[PDB]
């Protein structure tokens, strides 16, 4: 329950953390757990380093759609003004 948090906690969001820096927390030497991370995370496997590309991540806009539901909010809002009336 702590081991799977190394992937969850550390990011999002950091830029790039070096190879042996992540190994300092994971201990061992070159375990298959960090190898399974390179699969699971994905994320990135870089040489002598790890990357968060791309980028930081997914670049939320977030959305231009909520302008729709804003008109939906006025529907019941104008209805509440008519309930009084």
């Amino acid at each position: 329950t702590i081991r799977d948090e190394i992937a969850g906690c550390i990011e999002k969001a950091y830029e790039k953390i070096l190879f042996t820096e992540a190994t300092r927390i994971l201990f061992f030497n070159t375990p298959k757990k960090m190898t399974d991370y390179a699969k699971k995370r994905g994320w990135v496997l870089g040489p002598n380093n790890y990357y968060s590309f791309a980028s930081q991540q997914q670049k939320p806009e977030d959305t231009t759609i909520p302008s729709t539901e804003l008109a939906k909010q006025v529907i019941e809002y104008a209805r509440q003004l008519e309930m009084i009336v």
Binding site: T64, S67, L70, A71, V74, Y77, L81
Partner: protein
């Protein structure tokens, strides 16, 4: 306005399709498509092409909702307070 607006929309668009089929002339011409293309300043088709009018859509509702929020607050202060005042003055002083 949607009923009477869009029913003549369907009655004419079915007769305009009938043109190619039969009843030609009227060609018309040209008055039919001309002002229809004046209707085409906004179509409005998928989807609404409002990217410039999107933020402006809610921005026209900006103050309308704000005042409706501001008026109902003080109108309540006029309605709620004054009702409670005059009510308890008659209610409890009678018995």
């Amino acid at each position: 306005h949607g009923l009477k607006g869009l029913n003549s929309k369907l009655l004419d668009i079915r007769s305009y399709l009938e043109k190619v089929a039969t009843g030609k002339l009227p060609i018309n011409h040209q008055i039919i498509y001309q002002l229809q293309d004046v209707f085409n300043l906004l179509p409005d088709v998928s989807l609404q092409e409002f990217v410039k009018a999107f933020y402006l859509k809610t921005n026209d509702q900006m103050v309308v909702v704000y005042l409706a929020s501001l008026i109902r607050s003080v109108v309540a202060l006029h309605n709620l307070i004054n009702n409670k005042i005059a009510n308890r003055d008659a209610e409890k002083k009678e018995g």
